[PDB]
């Protein structure tokens, strides 16, 4: 989803300050609550590379 890879990509970090912004972040932005794509409705957090490889073998 991030389309991140580890050849030296950087991420920015942000901090939800308020009681309210924390609730948004936690209820609606938390990674583990966004497993399916909103474009196609197919899972997005899914087995990826070495993970498949392992399980296939």
């Amino acid at each position: 989803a991030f389309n991140a890879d580890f050849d030296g990509d950087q991420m920015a970090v942000h901090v939800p300050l308020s009681s309210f912004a924390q609730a948004e972040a936690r209820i609606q932005m938390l990674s583990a609550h966004n497993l399916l794509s909103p474009a196609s409705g197919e899972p997005l957090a899914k087995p990826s590379r070495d993970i498949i490889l392992g399980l296939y073998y």
Partner: protein, 226 residues
């Protein structure tokens, strides 16, 4: 690979997706029948032309030798059906089979691209953007405002109800549905705060400032910017 010899191409990829979202007469404009009917074909050495023929109605489509026919002598074509290979001009098609049909076309024609790239995305996403290309209508017979006025459709719950009924107003507003690209359809919003935020800033304000325009912050951009 091995397909550019001297025939005008159909757009592909992103440039095509744009061609649609702004559409926009296409490259190899495919000729479309304007009426339901039966096909007759006459030609010379030089001249070539298709006839669509009903009882009363009888339309002729004179067309170049360049054109690649799609339709047999003796076939039946519905209004808005293409007769040649190529992309249909949405404006042209809107005039032949109205709103719904053009919307359908736009959605698929866009899909055609993404899916050919292995990209999976629900239709409803495209349908939303398309609805916005049809946001506006043009007036043909006034109510109390003037004759052209390219102007939003859902301002019509009272204004397509004021004839005899609610507040009355002599003339019942007759309008023409209107197709416009996302660029143009975006310039045309009620919210001058948004409108000013896209291209051509000076114009928008000058316009709104004269008119004393209020912007009830209905969208997001306008609420954010504030």
């Amino acid at each position: 690979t091995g397909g550019v010899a001297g025939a005008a191409d159909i757009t592909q990829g992103l440039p095509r997706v744009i061609e649609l979202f702004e559409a926009r007469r296409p490259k190899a404009k495919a000729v479309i029948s304007e009426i339901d009917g039966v096909v007759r074909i006459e030609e010379t050495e030089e001249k070539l032309s298709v006839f669509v023929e009903s009882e009363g109605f009888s339309k002729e489509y004179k067309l170049p030798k360049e054109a690649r026919l799609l339709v047999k002598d003796g076939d039946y074509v519905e209004a808005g059906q293409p007769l040649t290979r190529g992309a249909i001009d949405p404006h042209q098609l809107l005039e032949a089979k109205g709103p719904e049909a053009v919307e359908r076309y736009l959605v698929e024609e866009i899909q055609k691209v993404y899916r050919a790239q292995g990209v999976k995305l629900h239709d409803k996403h495209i349908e939303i953007v398309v609805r916005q290309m049809m946001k506006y209508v043009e007036v043909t017979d006034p109510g109390d405002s003037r004759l052209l006025e390219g102007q939003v459709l859902e301002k019509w719950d009272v204004e397509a109800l004021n004839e005899r009924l609610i507040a009355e107003g002599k003339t019942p507003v007759a309008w023409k549905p209107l197709l416009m690209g996302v660029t143009k359809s975006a310039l045309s919003t009620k919210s001058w705060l948004s409108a000013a935020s896209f291209q051509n800033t000076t114009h928008v304000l000058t316009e709104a400032a004269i008119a004393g325009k209020k912007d009830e912050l209905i969208g997001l951009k306008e609420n954010v910017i504030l």
